[PDB]
Design a protein around this ligand. Structure first.
Ligand SMILES: Nc1ncnc2c1ncn2[C@@H]1O[C@H](COP(=O)(O)OP(=O)(O)NP(=O)(O)O)[C@@H](O)[C@H]1O
Lengths: 398, 50, 50, 51
């Protein structure tokens, strides 16, 4: 509470009016952190782990969103808080009751610390409404979002690689989540989606939307550690020297060995890898850094200053996205427990199709109309849709 | 011949992913971009159900 | 000669400095910990943090 | 399921007869394929469908 009271005191310089509220956000933030850590435990799910990082992410997320965001009222700040609260903590939660448990906790927290009645519904929907299409990250209209996304998804489906795809509300929520995640300063994400859920291709969509350079590590059974180093090595150089802002997509297919686990335990957690640039290779990098720095209009005296600028560059401009399927097997669970992963990865839980979106997919595929005759029986007996057509019958059977 | 063991260099080939050109069609494998034919077929084969 | 404890430096860092990954908000435990690291390291004995 | 929602299917139906040519059936068995309905159902699924 003391640590993060200092943090809020630092980020609230952007909203001096609300300066008085430094402690109760810090208190409410640590409270939530404690309760969450208490309610959801590793006995239920392997990935329920909470560390101070979650408190770190919550402040950081709020900082950027305030800074980039519109003029704030108290309601504005505390809802924004609740958004980041949702994404940092609850987005990892499976099922429903647990997400509802979190909503209840959120309501309780707000009531206990910051009692304003100007709030609306604070549930996971009714809040996030996270502006991307709108230039400053405000709340949005939701009809505009779905359309913007859909036209930019039509564009992306045609312009970039063509794997026929389908849209659903389900997609939209996770899209906002992936984008907001790639917007946050030092941050990475892991999508637990089962498989075929369309999580990699969605990452790629946002990467295409925000014009981030996509890198998928190319490896195999004979692939070495020296090989993965060079990928990371080159990826970092571009993230710093050329200001490329790259998104590195790791699948669980990609790992033939754990060596991939660890070197990133580093890159995620802290902002650099010390071993990676070494020997003369270090001096070459340093030279370049001096040049780029001086070209930015900053002459940095010491060497560590250059390297401090460099690391900060890796932090804000390099995002990593894991996509894993079955957290339950030992191969992925090695990825899972591993803390530097789970605690600097924003865990986002997708799963098998929603059985509703199964219809949205099905219906959008049978959109072409070969379908004939009459329904002798408007269904008279007995979740896809209210069933009228042969179309609906088919997607219900399937 | 051994599907039992499978390395992801083929991953871009299993999922259908290709960067199209005017004439050529290319698929990244490992560190190199190779041209696909289209008279090309693939069959993965394994023996033990284990 | 006296025995006193838990005296800490006050830090104020600008908003844009909040995003630096290498940062520390000094707490009682920070100082206490940093100090036993030093003492151990001046004894040439090794450290492992778990 | 095709019955429960109302959609007609051919009460007498066999996968093989539906999706395989005589020539196909003949051609596969020539390459050494086993006699079974099973291995014919299979050989159809492998050949007949590649996306
Ligand atoms: N909306 C969709 N419409 C049609 N097929 C889809 C859709 N979403 C996903 N798929 C299928 O799933 C794949 C989408 O790519 P991808 O995102 O890589 O799946 P994935 O969930 O990421 N599997 P993984 O590599 O473990 O993450 C394609 O091969 C499609 O067959």
């Amino acid at each position: 509470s003391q640590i993060y009271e200092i943090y809020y005191k630092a980020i609230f310089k952007l909203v001096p009016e609300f300066r008085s509220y430094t402690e109760p956000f810090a208190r409410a933030s640590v409270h939530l952190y404690n309760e969450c850590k208490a309610r959801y435990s590793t006995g239920l799910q392997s990935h329920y782990l909470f560390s101070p990082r979650e408190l770190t992410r919550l402040v950081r997320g709020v900082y950027t969103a305030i800074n980039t965001g519109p003029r704030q009222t108290l309601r504005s700040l505390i809802r924004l808080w609740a958004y980041e609260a949702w994404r940092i903590f609850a987005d990892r939660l499976v099922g429903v009751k647990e997400k509802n448990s979190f909503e209840q906790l959120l309501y309780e927290t707000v009531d206990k610390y910051l009692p304003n009645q100007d709030l609306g519904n604070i549930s996971s929907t009714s809040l996030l409404f996270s502006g991307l299409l709108s230039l400053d990250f405000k709340e949005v209209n939701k009809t505009d979002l779905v359309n913007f996304i859909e036209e930019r998804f039509k564009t992306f489906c045609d312009e970039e690689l063509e794997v026929p795809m389908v849209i659903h509300e389900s997609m939209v929520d996770h899209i906002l989540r992936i984008d907001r995640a790639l917007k946050q300063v030092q941050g990475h994400m892991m999508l637990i989606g089962a498989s075929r859920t369309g999580k990699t291709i969605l990452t790629r969509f946002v990467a295409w939307l925000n014009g981030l350079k996509i890198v998928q590590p190319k490896i195999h059974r004979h692939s070495n550690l020296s090989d993965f180093d060079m990928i990371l090595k080159k990826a970092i150089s571009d993230c710093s020297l050329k200001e490329s802002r790259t998104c590195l997509i790791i699948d669980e297919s990609n790992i033939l060995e754990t060596a991939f686990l660890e070197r990133m335990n580093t890159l995620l957690a802290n902002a650099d890898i010390p071993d990676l640039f070494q020997g003369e290779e270090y001096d070459k990098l340093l030279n370049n850094l001096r040049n780029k720095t001086r070209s930015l209009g900053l002459l940095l005296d010491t060497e560590q200053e250059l390297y401090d600028w460099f690391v900060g560059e890796i932090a804000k401009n390099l995002h990593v996205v894991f996509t894993i399927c079955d957290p339950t097997n030992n191969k992925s669970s090695a990825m899972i427990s591993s803390p530097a992963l789970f605690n600097r990865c924003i865990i986002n839980w997708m799963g098998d199709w929603d059985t509703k979106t199964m219809s949205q997919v099905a219906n959008n595929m049978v959109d072409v109309i070969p379908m004939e005759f009459t329904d002798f029986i408007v269904p008279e007996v007995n979740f896809t849709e209210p069933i009228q057509t042969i179309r609906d019958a088919v997607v219900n059977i399937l | 011949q051994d599907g039992e063991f499978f390395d992801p260099i083929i991953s871009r080939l299993i999922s259908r992913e290709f960067n199209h050109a005017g004439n050529r069609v290319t698929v990244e494998i490992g560190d190199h971009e190779v041209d696909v034919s289209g008279d090309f077929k693939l069959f993965i084969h394994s023996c033990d159900p284990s | 000669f006296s025995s006193f404890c838990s005296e800490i430096p006050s830090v104020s860092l600008e908003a844009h400095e909040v995003m630096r990954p290498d940062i520390v908000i000094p707490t009682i435990d920070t100082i206490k910990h940093e100090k036993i690291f030093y003492d151990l390291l001046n004894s040439k004995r090794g450290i492992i943090l778990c | 399921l095709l019955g429960k929602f109302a959609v007609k299917y051919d009460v007498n139906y066999r996968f093989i007869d539906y999706l395989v040519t005589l020539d196909e059936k003949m051609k596969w068995l020539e390459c050494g394929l086993d006699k079974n309905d099973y291995f014919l159902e299979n050989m159809s699924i492998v050949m007949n469908s590649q996306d």
